[PDB]
Design an enzyme around this catalytic site. Structure first.
Site, PDB file in Angstrom:
ATOM      1  N   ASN A  26      -8.970 -45.875  14.253  1.00 52.86           N
ATOM      2  CA  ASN A  26     -10.269 -46.289  14.789  1.00 52.86           C
ATOM      3  C   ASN A  26     -11.271 -45.134  14.634  1.00 52.86           C
ATOM      4  O   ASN A  26     -11.286 -44.145  15.373  1.00 52.86           O
ATOM      5  CB  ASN A  26     -10.167 -46.730  16.242  1.00 52.86           C
ATOM      6  CG  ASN A  26     -11.471 -47.299  16.815  1.00 52.86           C
ATOM      7  OD1 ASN A  26     -12.524 -47.356  16.182  1.00 52.86           O
ATOM      8  ND2 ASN A  26     -11.354 -47.780  18.060  1.00 52.86           N
ATOM      9  N   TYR A  96      -3.618 -30.420  24.478  1.00 57.06           N
ATOM     10  CA  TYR A  96      -3.091 -29.446  25.382  1.00 57.06           C
ATOM     11  C   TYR A  96      -4.107 -28.853  26.373  1.00 57.06           C
ATOM     12  O   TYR A  96      -3.619 -28.018  27.164  1.00 57.06           O
ATOM     13  CB  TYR A  96      -2.415 -28.240  24.651  1.00 57.06           C
ATOM     14  CG  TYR A  96      -1.106 -28.580  24.021  1.00 57.06           C
ATOM     15  CD1 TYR A  96      -0.010 -28.996  24.816  1.00 57.06           C
ATOM     16  CD2 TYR A  96      -0.934 -28.486  22.640  1.00 57.06           C
ATOM     17  CE1 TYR A  96       1.218 -29.344  24.239  1.00 57.06           C
ATOM     18  CE2 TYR A  96       0.252 -28.847  22.044  1.00 57.06           C
ATOM     19  CZ  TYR A  96       1.320 -29.277  22.841  1.00 57.06           C
ATOM     20  OH  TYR A  96       2.468 -29.586  22.177  1.00 57.06           O
ATOM     21  N   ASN A 189      -1.650 -16.270  33.984  1.00 53.86           N
ATOM     22  CA  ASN A 189      -2.312 -17.156  33.035  1.00 53.86           C
ATOM     23  C   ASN A 189      -1.737 -16.959  31.623  1.00 53.86           C
ATOM     24  O   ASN A 189      -1.745 -15.836  31.126  1.00 53.86           O
ATOM     25  CB  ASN A 189      -3.808 -17.007  32.906  1.00 53.86           C
ATOM     26  CG  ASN A 189      -4.703 -17.297  34.045  1.00 53.86           C
ATOM     27  OD1 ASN A 189      -4.532 -18.231  34.875  1.00 53.86           O
ATOM     28  ND2 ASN A 189      -5.757 -16.473  34.139  1.00 53.86           N
ATOM     29  N   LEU A 190      -1.371 -18.108  31.112  1.00 58.89           N
ATOM     30  CA  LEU A 190      -0.864 -18.164  29.693  1.00 58.89           C
ATOM     31  C   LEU A 190      -2.185 -18.094  28.920  1.00 58.89           C
ATOM     32  O   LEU A 190      -3.007 -19.037  28.966  1.00 58.89           O
ATOM     33  CB  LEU A 190       0.039 -19.362  29.611  1.00 58.89           C
ATOM     34  CG  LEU A 190       0.922 -19.571  28.417  1.00 58.89           C
ATOM     35  CD1 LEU A 190       2.042 -18.519  28.351  1.00 58.89           C
ATOM     36  CD2 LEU A 190       1.516 -20.982  28.449  1.00 58.89           C
ATOM     37  N   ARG A 223       8.182 -34.869  27.233  1.00 61.21           N
ATOM     38  CA  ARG A 223       8.361 -33.532  26.676  1.00 61.21           C
ATOM     39  C   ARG A 223       7.424 -32.587  27.490  1.00 61.21           C
ATOM     40  O   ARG A 223       6.190 -32.639  27.333  1.00 61.21           O
ATOM     41  CB  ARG A 223       8.016 -33.409  25.203  1.00 61.21           C
ATOM     42  CG  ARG A 223       8.451 -32.127  24.524  1.00 61.21           C
ATOM     43  CD  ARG A 223       7.714 -30.905  24.897  1.00 61.21           C
ATOM     44  NE  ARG A 223       6.349 -30.847  24.387  1.00 61.21           N
ATOM     45  CZ  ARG A 223       5.662 -29.729  24.164  1.00 61.21           C
ATOM     46  NH1 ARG A 223       6.195 -28.523  24.278  1.00 61.21           N
ATOM     47  NH2 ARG A 223       4.340 -29.779  23.948  1.00 61.21           N
ATOM     48  N   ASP A 225       5.775 -29.051  28.537  1.00 62.55           N
ATOM     49  CA  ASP A 225       5.203 -27.843  27.898  1.00 62.55           C
ATOM     50  C   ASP A 225       5.333 -26.608  28.785  1.00 62.55           C
ATOM     51  O   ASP A 225       5.342 -26.697  30.015  1.00 62.55           O
ATOM     52  CB  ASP A 225       3.756 -28.152  27.474  1.00 62.55           C
ATOM     53  CG  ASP A 225       3.002 -26.985  26.863  1.00 62.55           C
ATOM     54  OD1 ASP A 225       3.120 -26.730  25.661  1.00 62.55           O
ATOM     55  OD2 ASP A 225       2.237 -26.249  27.546  1.00 62.55           O
ATOM     56  N   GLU A 253      10.278 -27.315  26.650  1.00 60.33           N
ATOM     57  CA  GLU A 253      10.113 -26.407  25.547  1.00 60.33           C
ATOM     58  C   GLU A 253      10.055 -24.974  26.074  1.00 60.33           C
ATOM     59  O   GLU A 253       9.051 -24.571  26.658  1.00 60.33           O
ATOM     60  CB  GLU A 253       8.822 -26.611  24.755  1.00 60.33           C
ATOM     61  CG  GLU A 253       8.814 -25.794  23.460  1.00 60.33           C
ATOM     62  CD  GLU A 253       7.467 -25.308  22.990  1.00 60.33           C
ATOM     63  OE1 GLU A 253       6.969 -24.311  23.522  1.00 60.33           O
ATOM     64  OE2 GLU A 253       6.962 -26.012  22.084  1.00 60.33           O
ATOM     65  N   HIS A 323       5.512 -28.269  15.867  1.00 60.58           N
ATOM     66  CA  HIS A 323       4.084 -27.970  16.011  1.00 60.58           C
ATOM     67  C   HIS A 323       3.859 -26.466  16.160  1.00 60.58           C
ATOM     68  O   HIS A 323       2.821 -25.895  15.748  1.00 60.58           O
ATOM     69  CB  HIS A 323       3.590 -28.731  17.281  1.00 60.58           C
ATOM     70  CG  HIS A 323       4.461 -28.332  18.456  1.00 60.58           C
ATOM     71  ND1 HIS A 323       5.745 -28.808  18.675  1.00 60.58           N
ATOM     72  CD2 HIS A 323       4.187 -27.485  19.477  1.00 60.58           C
ATOM     73  CE1 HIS A 323       6.198 -28.268  19.797  1.00 60.58           C
ATOM     74  NE2 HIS A 323       5.292 -27.457  20.276  1.00 60.58           N
ATOM     75  N   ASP A 324       4.901 -25.820  16.730  1.00 61.71           N
ATOM     76  CA  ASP A 324       4.841 -24.392  16.993  1.00 61.71           C
ATOM     77  C   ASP A 324       5.339 -23.411  15.931  1.00 61.71           C
ATOM     78  O   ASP A 324       5.157 -22.176  16.185  1.00 61.71           O
ATOM     79  CB  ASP A 324       5.535 -24.089  18.344  1.00 61.71           C
ATOM     80  CG  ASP A 324       4.510 -24.255  19.486  1.00 61.71           C
ATOM     81  OD1 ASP A 324       3.342 -24.041  19.075  1.00 61.71           O
ATOM     82  OD2 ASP A 324       4.894 -24.576  20.608  1.00 61.71           O
TER      83      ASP A 324
HETATM   84 CA   LIG Z   1     -10.469 -42.220  15.452  1.00 60.72          CA
END
Ligand SMILES: [Ca+2]
Ligand SMILES: [Ca+2]
Length: 680
Positions: A26, A96, A189-190, A223, A225, A253, A323-324
């Site tokens: 979309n 995220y 803090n990350l 999942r 984080d 993770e 992804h990491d």
């Molecule tokens: Ca779109």
């Protein structure tokens, strides 16, 4: 479609998708301005993949003819709409940087769009796993409230507050981590993402409420984080929360480096009620098949130690990349290596995950080169066919979902591993070499004497083998890049427990048992010594309610109505009651050498006065500093507890607090904090 199993993924093939870069289903929900990058020329901004994107790939068959059975998507929640200060002009593309855990990410779609996804998945027998990131909000600057969106947190539209002026103390204000410690990484803090204060009641109810809203949408698993960024206590209490609600397969993770082993991580997978991404496997496979930093020997020890490190190794989530990391495939790389890793992963223990585009040989090193826009939908590549064949085997031969692993042969180059569950067996041989050849002699197998064709159909030059007398396999040549797969399946008639899910509960929860030889006639099931009321029986699967036993760990056995009784399945944990996160603080607790403080008390969650099962070591640097120690523990609600603190040596020594017990009535449906003095 059919009866999907939300607590048993061992027989699944996961397909991990980063929404924004998949398919733009979309175009109308596309962001514009500095938030968007037409052509995805700048990988740090929104590119356009939405939910519609995914339903198209579900419906047009790309996913289903691939053998994919479960889909893992980005956190669906509403992300921040500000752009970063960096050179690139970083957006919340990756889902995220949450803004509101109770609304959809409008770029990905509406709530309905969302529901059409799950359904579109469901109708075709595909489970849905969503990313959930409860640790933080978004990038923030206390000092510069203009930065992005001040890490603002909304509640279905209504504001809770930002990082600047946190009167409420919704977040932590102890700087960012340095990763100098486990403690350093939880209460700090990350990076500059606003760190939520889980001990805060508003926060604790808000996150718990949200997870529910999503489960309600009918997802099949979650999942988690930055698993090593949240306390432990709190996370266990959240798992208590989802289980009481509606059990869903959940995994965290906890990033691990190339040769990294951490007992804390071991503990997390084993005790939290959540399983974990299998980095050890990950990194390890990467060494032998892509990095040439290790060989099969390493891999083999990896497999052996792993099965002993994890109580439910079967629950670990495997991958060759994500992804990491840096994609398995490098530019100029040898694509057959991918094929090989794929064949290895799909036949290995644990729940296998494939990172979008692996089957297309996509490349990109570092973030965000590792998240390019889906290149092609070519269904003819080798990678895709191997998934096709192996996904069916996995669905078919139970040894793949539940069998253990035994090394039958090995070179630094050649590895031939066997998977067995009951009589079920799958044999696999791989030559990682590009030039040396071998003659596999003295190979021995559990396969019934016979002739076997490669389960790959020769995709990797797989041969036909012959099993003779004594489980001896006839000598055969194994050339460079060769992979062959042989399986044997047969009916069972002896009760065997393949999997149990979840592994944690209260009295009266629903537990599912998967296996074979259960027999069509309903028998009996036991938790230690007590018979469990059964809700449904089949030769494959039985659902039961945990009996009314005392809190603790129990073994599960299955006895068919014919009297046979299965070997047990270990460590089902029965919790005293609904869990809450309580912050135990102790003052003036001075120490020696390796000496550390622990907590022990009269309830199962606090070890039942067994110092061998004491909770700790306790923290003493961030929220509070030594000689004051603190720890966040998951514990039964509306309960009057007794506990004491103890000093434990490097080699066992235990020093008790020396007076009467500390008492405290744990809160109900909320968190608590208790601070006392070390009684000398
Ligand atoms: Ca779109
Ligand atoms: Ca944290």
């Amino acid at each position: 479609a059919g009866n999907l199993n939300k607590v048993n993924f061992t027989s699944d093939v996961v397909y991990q998708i980063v929404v924004d870069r998949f398919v733009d289903g979309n175009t109308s929900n596309n962001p514009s301005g500095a938030l968007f990058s037409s052509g995805c020329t700048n990988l740090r901004k929104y590119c356009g993949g939405d939910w519609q994107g995914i339903i198209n790939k579900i419906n047009d068959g790309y996913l289903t003819d691939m053998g994919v059975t479960a889909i893992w998507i980005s956190q669906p929640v509403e992300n921040v709409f500000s752009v970063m200060n960096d050179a690139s002009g970083s957006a919340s593309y990756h889902g995220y940087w949450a803004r509101d855990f109770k609304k959809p990410n409008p770029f990905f779609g509406t709530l309905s769009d969302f529901q059409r996804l799950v359904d579109a998945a469901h109708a075709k027998g595909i489970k849905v796993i969503i990313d959930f990131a409860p640790n933080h909000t978004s990038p923030a600057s206390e000092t510069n409230p203009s930065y992005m969106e001040n890490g603002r947190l909304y509640d279905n539209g209504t504001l809770l507050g930002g990082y600047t002026n946190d009167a409420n103390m919704y977040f932590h204000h102890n700087g960012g981590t340095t990763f100098s410690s486990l403690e350093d990484g939880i209460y700090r803090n990350l990076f500059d993402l606003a760190d939520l204060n889980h001990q805060n009641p508003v926060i604790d109810r808000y996150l718990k409420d949200a997870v529910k809203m999503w489960i309600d949408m009918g997802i099949d698993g979650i999942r988690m984080d930055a698993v090593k960024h949240m306390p432990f206590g709190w996370q266990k209490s959240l798992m208590d929360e989802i289980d009481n609600y509606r059990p869903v397969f959940t995994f965290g993770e906890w990033f691990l480096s190339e040769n990294e082993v951490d007992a804390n991580n071991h503990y997390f997978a084993n005790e939290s009620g959540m399983s974990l991404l299998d980095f050890r496997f990950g990194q390890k496979l990467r060494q032998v098949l892509r990095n040439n930093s290790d060989n099969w020997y390493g891999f083999n020890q990896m497999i052996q130690d792993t099965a002993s490190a994890y109580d439910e190794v079967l629950d670990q989530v495997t991958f060759i990349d994500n992804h990491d990391m840096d994609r398995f495939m490098i530019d100029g790389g040898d694509p057959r290596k991918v094929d090989m890793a794929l064949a290895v992963l799909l036949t290995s223990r644990g729940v296998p995950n494939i990172y979008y585009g692996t089957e297309q040989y996509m490349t990109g090193n570092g973030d965000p080169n590792n998240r390019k826009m889906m290149s092609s939908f070519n269904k003819n590549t080798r990678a895709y066919q191997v998934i096709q064949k192996l996904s069916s085997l996995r669905r078919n031969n139970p040894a793949l979902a539940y069998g253990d692993t035994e090394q039958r042969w090995i070179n630094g180059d050649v590895y031939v591993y066997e998977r067995q569950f009951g009589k079920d067996v799958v044999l696999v041989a791989v030559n990682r070499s590009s030039s040396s050849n071998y003659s596999i002699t003295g190979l021995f197998t559990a396969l019934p004497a016979g002739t076997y064709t490669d389960q790959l159909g020769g995709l990797l030059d797989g041969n036909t083998i012959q099993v003779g007398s004594n489980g001896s396999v006839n000598a055969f040549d194994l050339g460079p890049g060769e992979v062959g797969v042989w399986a044997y399946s047969a009916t069972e008639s002896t009760p065997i427990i393949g999997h149990v899910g979840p592994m944690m509960g209260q009295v009266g929860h629903q537990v599912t048992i998967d296996g074979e030889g259960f027999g069509t006639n309903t028998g009996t099931v036991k938790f230690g010594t007590t018979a469990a009321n059964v809700v449904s029986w089949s030769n494959n699967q039985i659902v039961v309610a945990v009996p009314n036993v005392s809190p603790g760990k129990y073994n599960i056995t299955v006895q068919s109505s014919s009297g046979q009784t299965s070997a047990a399945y270990d460590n089902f944990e029965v919790l005293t009651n609904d869990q809450v996160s309580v912050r135990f603080v102790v003052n003036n607790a001075t120490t020696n050498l390796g000496q550390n403080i622990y907590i022990v008390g009269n309830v199962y969650e606090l070890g039942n006065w067994d110092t061998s099962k004491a909770i700790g070591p306790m923290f003493n640097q961030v929220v509070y500093s030594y000689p004051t120690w603190y720890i966040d523990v998951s514990v039964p609600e509306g309960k009057t507890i007794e506990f004491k603190f103890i000093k434990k040596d490097s080699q066992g020594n235990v020093t008790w607090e020396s007076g009467s017990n500390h008492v405290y009535t744990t809160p109900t449906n909320t968190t608590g904090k208790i601070i006392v003095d070390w009684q000398n």
